[model samples]
Target: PPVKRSLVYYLKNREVRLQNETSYSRVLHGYAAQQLPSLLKEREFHLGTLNKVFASQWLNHRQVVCGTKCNTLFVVDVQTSQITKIPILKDRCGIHAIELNPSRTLLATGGDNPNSLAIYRLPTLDPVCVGDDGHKDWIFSIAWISDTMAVSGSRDGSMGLWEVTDDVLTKSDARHNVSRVPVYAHITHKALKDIPKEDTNPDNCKVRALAFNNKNKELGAVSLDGYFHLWKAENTLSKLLSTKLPYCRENVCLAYGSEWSVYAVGSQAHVSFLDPRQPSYNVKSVCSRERGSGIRSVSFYEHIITVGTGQGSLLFYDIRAQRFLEENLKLTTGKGWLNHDETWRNYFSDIDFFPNAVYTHCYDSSGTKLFVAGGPLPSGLHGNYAGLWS
Candidate 1:
């Protein structure tokens, strides 16, 4: 009787905490004569059974574009949640990263196979261009610098510049001239090879993430060794500036804010924010105490930075305050959820933040929409699901 009653007390206390933490309960409590019925109806519409849904966007006409690791693309209707699979990428490659152009009419995807850069027209999902000899390895990142020009970073230690005309890729070129080149070449004629091998590798490291600011004048790259390299768009002969990271790890994502703020996060589970103008910048650790797996992706939305961890935990960091805004939810802590915490270490491989919530992709469904295609779910794993919150 004592154990039973103790359980009851704990449940009651947990209910109080849940009610205070979730906004859904607050809206339900404020139901009025006219709004009560509609609110109840909205709650009945359950999240549907969509699997392996990766990299989703709300395109024009309320359509959604989703990329999957299975080498398939999907277009879904937001209102009805109806999904349509686009087979353009059948044998193209392993879809790892995707971005919709600012115009929303163009979609770009980068993957593991060679010639990984491909573009498609929206709504119709028609292939516009497939870049040739784009990268020796997987294209890990891509950004549209303008309607005509785009940039891509890869695992092959190369950065590419592509010229897009009329929705087609043309005149692609790769630049590695600055890799072995000295930053102080003007001051000295010393050859980069003349330097020690360790220093040469650091200077010629592979780029993991690339970002262009709103002004479009400066482009930034975060390399595997934690160096932040800034370059001018018009000139690639020399780096404008370079800063070393406080800690070392391959940076997976980089984002720039409107106020000259730049952020980078990666496997080290730390998010660093730097002010370009300051000689000495501040770097903060966001997920140092997180019990989830390593941090895979990060994005900056205004003052809030969203981080996706390997355990399928989406953490929101308040940049100004340098604190977590939302508590993390462990996928293994609940029933009908993915239970392999180890696999979660690879689950959330990518993340994208929107105005309302963040979207993430994982190799497993323990905390994803579906089994995306790269791997099979472990035994006793139930179904796949995706999460969203304001």
Candidate 2:
């Protein structure tokens, strides 16, 4: 005899729950660590000297564009491991964020210098326009609401919404009380509240990363101020929810999960799952025991949430189970082990993990290819690594 499929059944049969159809689909489409066949390295690419690979976004199943600590961005063909460098801002600051639009035609990038956001044409890598009048500080993250609309988050304590046209990016008057109301005034203005005076400093308010859910038309962001902020993305940016995660220490990255679920990871080696529909206080977490140097990047496909750590390793979590897949934990790659005696264990696997920080990693649109890249360790400011896995 069999029972109906529901949360009750999922809760009671925790061990066999993943055998369900929906759970199997999550694993199959999620680029699950268990399904990974020994992580056969397709190719390795050495990007630059002492350049930390900070951001990467899949242009499609075959192409990926990545930014570096050096003032450079490059397109990588994962299949052939071919690199095409885009020569923009040759002597400018390092790029920290890269975002591909929904249509996969345009690229939005943010960097470590003032007025850092720039739009580039894809495939050709030609400059469309530079947001020279943008953020006063480093632009750390970007999210595309639509093919022509994007938002940029800065270390300067504000987020800017830009309307993309064929030639230039026009900054929308997102904030209220402005004399000139832009054409896109459907965007309502809302002030941020519940922020401490100490955290009001721009230095403490750096927006580390941003994630947008096109299906739900939602925007998610994490800031150095230690709060996860969710916004409704319609004609304008409007705050919906904000909370400081209990398990998070220093917020670094954000990724949208299934439905209204959002995942925020901190530098303290922890990640919190939040639901705006539920009470702000209601949240689940993973990584009960801190390990590695801390998480710096995160990405989600289905139930599998992949987090890249500062120590050049990766961890996969199944959101339904709210834990790392046991099969993945047992899959070995190199001469590395989780040291139980150590306070912060090193998650090392020579074949899978990088030599430095795992600054960024992502799966292609098809969820068949995985690309990981990073640069330099805290101990030394040298070396870089980029590899493709399938």
- For lDDT, the strongest prediction is 2
After superposition, candidate 2 runs with Cα above 4 Å error: 1-34, 37-42, 48-50, 89-92, 111-114, 166-202, 258-260, 288-292, 327-355
Predict model 1's lDDT versus the native: 0.47
Compute the lDDT of residue 325 as modeled in candidate 2.
62
Candidate 1 local lDDT, 340-365, one digit each (tens): 34434465323122111122422111
lDDT of 1 at 22: 38
Candidate 2 per-residue lDDT, tens place, 1-390, comes to 874545445556556765455653433454444455345344566453535677887877888888876767788887777778875541125687888887777787863344556776665555555344445667777888888788878776577777675324222223223434222222211222222223434458777778888767888777776776777778777878776656445566777765435655655667777665567567767772426566767777666777776666567777667777654442111211121222223432222333356678898777668787775344324345677767
Candidate 2 is scored at a TM of 0.74
Alpha-carbon deviation at 366 in model 1, angstroms: 28
